[PDB]
Amino acid sequence: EIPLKYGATNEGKRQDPAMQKFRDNRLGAFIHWGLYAIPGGEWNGKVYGGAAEWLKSWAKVPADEWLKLMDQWNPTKFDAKKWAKMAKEMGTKYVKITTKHHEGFCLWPSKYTKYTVANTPYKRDILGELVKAYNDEGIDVHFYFSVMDWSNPDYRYDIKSKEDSIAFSRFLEFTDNQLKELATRYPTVKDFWFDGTWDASVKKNGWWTAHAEQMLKELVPGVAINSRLRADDKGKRHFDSNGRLMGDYESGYERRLPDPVKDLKVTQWDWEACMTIPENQWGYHKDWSLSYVKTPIEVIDRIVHAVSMGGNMVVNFGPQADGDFRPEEKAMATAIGKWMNRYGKAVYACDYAGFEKQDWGYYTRGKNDEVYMVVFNQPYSERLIVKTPKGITVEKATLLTTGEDITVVETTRNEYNVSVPKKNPGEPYVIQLKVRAA
Ligand SMILES: COc1ccc([C@H]2[C@H](O)[C@H](O)[C@H](C)N2C)cc1
């Protein structure tokens, strides 16, 4: 036991209604929208293959020159009602929005910097319009926020001097001011998801990370705060020096997921994964031929995978400079939405089922002990193997869409074959099991 002032304080999962809502939501969208949408991965005739939102770094653009992109910020097709409708039709229950990425441009009219939507031709408070539009559709809003800020020259990557320590304190005060502004201007915010907290400077200032968490919780009753924010007294991130989770949920799975057989430890805490559609583009990149682009089924598979292991999934979108979405993202959202409309009872408010993993897909568990079999890989044998835990029996199987009864045959002591449906559903599909415990 290492004594710590800025280590974990939550033991186990929060169970207040606000955390239950965060969890039950299950499926979210991410919006990465910032000045990077304008060049879209390309600078002075060179298309950089790295993540578009990091182009300032790939092309070594000075801050002042990068931020001049504000003079081109005029997303005339932006319509916050349409964005919220796209999200609603996709079946997302929440949206995480980049309020400020590393570049330092604010999507709200901050009074603490001039690098904001207010000082662009478009002028309008994008963040505020989205908050209202999403909330009107019954969709929760979470705020992404980059502590690392390339526009503020008081930022430091490490503290090598008295002068660095003083500048960095001032940077942290600046940061607090913007955070307070976000929390008070948009009081329906449900979560703050921090990024840009990996540098030695932040790791040396764990206390500030604890403070930011407490400060926002005081301002916003029930707000969630991601693990990525947090560093303890020693500079240990996400989990403290005693191995305890800091913040309200674990937030490292990014472009990867826990192993359904080997990583069952994740079921012990809330957690949230985020993913990109291409391999590694968050902001709008104009050229998606450069890497593998996931299909809707691949995305759905990840969504179900996360829920099957007690986690949320958040699918990223990188809106165009003009304020519309690219055709690939419209198609994706529509395809996810159609699936979720049919099969979402197995996703929303579901969780880990406690069954041994089978090859046909995933199990999820509903609030009233429903066990859903979500089938992604159809056996030529036409039999879906179900091995139940000790004391559990399967009493019925039903095809979710139609209510048709599905034959269940006991094959051994703890195992059944659940038949595939008489007609191949032609897409990943759900069989709902009624189970009984001794
Ligand atoms: C490996 O270092 C990284 C990778 C991704 C990021 C950023 C991406 O730009 C995106 O916002 C992702 C969610 N974030 C962690 C930051 C540092």
Residue 212 and residue 223 in contact, taking contact as beta carbons nearer than 8 Å: no
Q: Residue 143 CB: number of other CB atoms within 10 A? A: 25
CA-to-CA distance for 303 and 86, rounded, in angstroms? 18
User: For residue 365, how many other CB atoms are within 10 A of its CB?
Assistant: 22
Atom of ligand 1 nearest to the CA of 32: 11
Could you identify the residue written with the tokens 């607090």?
A: 176
- Tell me which residue has its CA closest to atom 11 in ligand 1: 282
CA distance 228 to 248: 10
CA 225–ligand 1 middle distance (angstroms): 17
C-alpha atoms less than 13 angstroms from C-alpha of 54 in its C-beta half-sphere: 10
User: Ligand 1 pocket, 273 CB below 6 A?
Assistant: no
Rounded to whole angstroms, how far apart are CA atoms 318 and 283? 5
The span from the first CA to the last CA of the chain, in angstroms, equals: 40
CB–CB of 95/86 below 8 Å? no
Q: Please tell me the distance from the alpha carbon of residue 55 to that of residue 47, in angstroms, as a whole number.
A: 9
Which numbered atom of ligand 1 lies nearest the CA of 146? Answer: 11
Which of 144, 281, 282, 317 best tests ligand 1's pocket when mutated (most atoms within 8 Å of CB)? 282
Return the structure tokens found at 315.
Answer: 């699918």
Ligand 1 within 6 A of CB of 195: yes
Can you tell me which atom of ligand 1 is nearest the CA of 282? Answer: 10
Tokens of 188: 């329906």
- Breaks after residues in the chain, judged by C–N over 2.5 Å: none
Alpha-carbon torsion (241, 247, 250, 253), positive or negative: negative
Q: How far, in Å, CA of 222 to CA of 50, rounded?
A: 37
Tell me how far apart the alpha carbons of residues 143 and 43 are, in angstroms, rounded to a whole number.
28
| Distance of CA 54 from the midpoint of ligand 1 (Å) | 8
How far apart are the C-alpha atoms of 69 and 134, rounded to whole Å?
27
* Angstrom distance (rounded) from CA 361 to CA 132: 38
26 Cβ contact partners less than 8 Å away, ≥ 6 residues apart: 93, 303, 306, 307, 312, 313, 347, 348, 349, 350
- Other beta carbons within 10 angstroms of residue 395's beta carbon come to 9
CA distance readout (Å), 212 to 16, 111, 215, 225, 379: 21, 19, 5, 9, 51
Q: Does residue 53 have its Cβ closer than 6 Å to ligand 1? A: yes
CA–centroid distance, 273 to ligand 1, in Å, is 13
In the chain, which residues fall in CATH 2.60.40.1180? 349-437
Helix axes 206-219, 162-185, angle to 10 degrees: 20
Give the separation between CA 331 and CA 337, rounded to whole angstroms: 10
The type of residue at 424 is: N
* 278 phi, psi to nearest 5 deg: -75, 180
Structure tokens at 431: 């069989």
The fourth-level CATH superfamily of domain 349-437 is Golgi alpha-mannosidase II (2.60.40.1180)
Pairwise CA distance, residues 376 & 156, whole Å: 47
Q: In this structure, how many other beta carbons lie within 10 angstroms of the beta carbon of residue 121?
A: 12
Dist. CA 405–CA 67, nearest whole Å: 61
Token readout for 135 is 């909330």
For ligand 1, mutation pick of 107, 195, 281 (most atoms within 8 Å of CB): 195
CB distance 351 to ligand 1 below 6 Å? no
* Whole-number Cα distances in Å, 246 to 207, 250, 274: 12, 8, 18
- If you search the block for the tokens 């090598």, which residue do you land on? 160
Phi, psi of 208 (to 5 degrees): -70, -40
Using the Cα atoms of residue 208, residue 209, residue 214 and residue 216 in order, give the sign of their dihedral: positive
Q: What whole-number distance in Å separates Cα of residue 102 and Cα of residue 67?
A: 12
Resolution attained, angstroms: 2.0
Nearest CA among 11, 24, 12 for reference residue 367: 24
For strands 392-399 and 94-100, give the pairing. unpaired
Q: Please tell me the residue having the least CA distance from ligand 1 atom 17.
A: 196
249: closest CA among 273, 271, 276? 271
Distance 181 CA to ligand 1 centre (A): 24
One-letter-per-residue 3-state SS of the chain: CCCCCCCCCCCCCCCCHHHHHHHHHCEEEEECCCHHHCCCCEECCEECCCCHHHHHHHCCCCHHHHHHHHHHCCCCCCCHHHHHHHHHHHCCCEEEEEEECCCCCECCCCCCCCCEHHHCCCCCCHHHHHHHHHHHCCCEEEEEEECCCCCCCCCCCCCCCHHHHHHHHHHHHHHHHHHHHHHHHCCCCCEEEEECCCCHHHHCCHHHHHHHHHHHHHHCCCCEEEHHHCECCCCCECECCCCCECCCEECCCECCCCCCCCCHHHHHCCEEEEECCECCCCCCCCCHHHCCECCHHHHHHHHHHHHHCCCEEEEEECCCCCCCCCHHHHHHHHHHHHHHHHHHHHCCCCECCCCCCECCEEEEECCCCCEEEEECCCCCCCEEEEECCCCEEEEEEEECCCCCEECEEEEECCEEEEECCCCCCCCCEEEEEEEEEC
Q: Where in the chain is the domain with CATH 3.20.20.80?
A: 1-348+438-438
Which atom of ligand 1 is found nearest the CA of 101? 11
- CB 266 within 8 Å of CB 18: no
Q: Is 1-348+438-438 assigned to CATH 3.20.20.80?
A: yes
How determined?
Answer: X-ray
